């Protein structure tokens, strides 16, 4: 038995955020029926295909454990089918624009009338009631809207986007929390709920630490752990040392440690030609002696200039650069193991190639080979939560309208009605 | 009614990942009892305080809607107290080191004997069964382990950490999904489960899109939407040109679209002296005519060199630089407003200062002013999921051991025993 066995999900979602949510629900046992536009369907199907006339990897990696029906929802017949489907659903999920589901004929008030137990779940750009509730938002726009871009990158570069989907997949996971929370409401009340996640808000939630930093900056005028607060560290375009004298909003700190121990991203052997030949190295106070041992600077063990956190505050970047010189002829895994034998936590930058072929990730079900007999097998990311009672059974993504007639039969339609719907181009 | 009304959480968590999970459960109505170390408590209390001997903003922004008890869990009396608390709990949450809770005497097996209904939830660094399962992992190392660092930043710079807590807060939110899924299944089985999220896996889930790219790269040798696909655009530090001829693992693409739909980070008025004076601008293929009107380039609408994704691959960055010239005398808000007239996906890089003081975010309850008459009021991030039937009631973070005696009384202890435990320094 899996957690969402028996949960019927009516899934209107397309692209990334909504589809990630309903896929993960599918991995935990949900019965997900993906409603798609006739002819073309989810636009990710035709997005950067590696095989001619085959659904893309963008589509397959976000739409496993789902069935597909085609439907023209602007038809009277299409709306009637929708009503029948809503009556059999536990959860409806959508990411249409602001007011779009209302405009296609399905307000929250009407949905409740159709099914007093259904949960309506929406992904939005900005929250309902926001001044900017009307704006379109995509992945990187949300990263910008939510404070991540402003605080990611370097002090002498632009605002920078994360390769991680802070906007789309993250908002999807947030909506899954909302949906699951609404299921627990329903166990208590016996009735459904409307739930919504704004992409800005899902981003902001992960940037909570930078809102801590903004308040600290306003209250005290300084962030002591940031590069800009330390001598001989950060400089601008024209070589002047930076400082918090003139900084009133949380700045970019490059690869600085932040809310943890002071750290930096250090080059290992081959960095000129291997973009991922790096480790992240941290200087914990109470490791200082074993660091001195590792890098053979015994003189630094006794010297008050280097001996303490206070002493190192004017030379931390120079200390990182020196440690880096010791990694110049060593590989990133070599350095990690070297650090470990001194009790020093250190970690390599994993390339996507390394991750795609790592045996450990495949052993634990985090990287999974999906059996796809139509398209050829592909890798995906599985469930990042591991459970004592079960594991996901990941099955291939659906062809466009693959399950249209099968779903119609489940609604109770006979052959005659089904053929008429095809005739009238409703499905 | 609140989703987690009547749910009792025994909360061992400290620092960021675990506390974020339990705070958000508290926001949704859970009764959270936070077990803390005697004297010092959660180490975030004393980290980067903005006011002497006042619990830090790191602590207060991660520990609202919790009660605090001090406990020496090493003592025989402390352990039997834990036994009584476990029998009353629905969820136990921990982020101690590998095997630490086991070695305290509280294996999953023993926990099941104490309470068949209780759910055990853990934050780990690497998944159980992983080669690295024994390692402790911190924020930026987790970002490196999960593919985020490798795919974030620029092609001529280093792997770059995100300002977003992709390791800590992200893992906590994923753990919350795991906990709620376990509650949902307990309604069917009547039994608790063990659930775990690893930091590497939480990061990898958000980097799903980069695993698509790796497979595309291995299969085809080209990622056509990446900057390096534009001939003679990207170079390394030595001025050597970059292209997919010699790229075998997913590279950093600067401010490229990722999950979009191509886009870039474009300067607005004041960029020279304002780090966040930028917008993100997306060239969605279906909106090229609208874009041409906005930037007064009608000749680009019918030109095969400009009017498709394929035509623009060799010149996309030249188009971005031209669009940017149109924003030279407009601030980011006026540019966003202008683009929105055309329906073009485009928005500002919001500064943390701007987010901290934004009226819209406070209206919708995503930025919340917490009433704290002991410490003074502070801002925090509220629930990023909004519900039709309830709103969170956020209450100030507990003082160290504030609720110790209160919690002991609930366990049925008399005043004599409570006095004895204080005298023995168990509490």
Swiss-Prot record, chains A, B:
It comes from the Bacteria. CoA binds at residues 14-17, 37, 71-74, 95-97, 103, 136-139. Optimum pH is between 6.5 and 7.5. Changing residue 47 to F: Little change in the affinity binding and catalytic efficiency, and it does not display major structural changes. It is found in: Cytoplasm. Substrate binds at residues 259-261. Inhibited by the sulfhydryl reagents N-ethylmaleimide and p-chloromercuribenzoate, and by chloride. Competitively inhibited by acetyl-CoA. Gene3D superfamilies: Crotonobetainyl-coa:carnitine coa-transferase, domain 1, formyl-coa transferase, domain 3. GO terms for molecular function: formyl-CoA transferase activity. The active site is at residue 168. Changing residue 47 to P: Little change in the affinity binding and catalytic efficiency. It exhibits substrate inhibition with oxalate. It does not display major structural changes. Its main location: cytoplasm. GO terms for cellular component: cytoplasm. Pathway: Metabolic intermediate degradation; oxalate degradation; CO(2) and formate from oxalate: step 1/2. One of its GO terms (biological process) is oxalate catabolic process. Keywords: Cytoplasm, Transferase. The keyword Zinc does not apply. It is an enzyme of class 2 (transferase). It catalyses: formyl-CoA + oxalate = oxalyl-CoA + formate; formyl-CoA + succinate = succinyl-CoA + formate. Its EC number is 2.8.3.16. Belongs to the CoA-transferase III family. Frc subfamily. Homodimer. This is Formyl-CoA:oxalate CoA-transferase. It comes from Oxalobacter formigenes. The lineage of its organism: Bacteria, Pseudomonadati, Pseudomonadota, Betaproteobacteria, Burkholderiales.
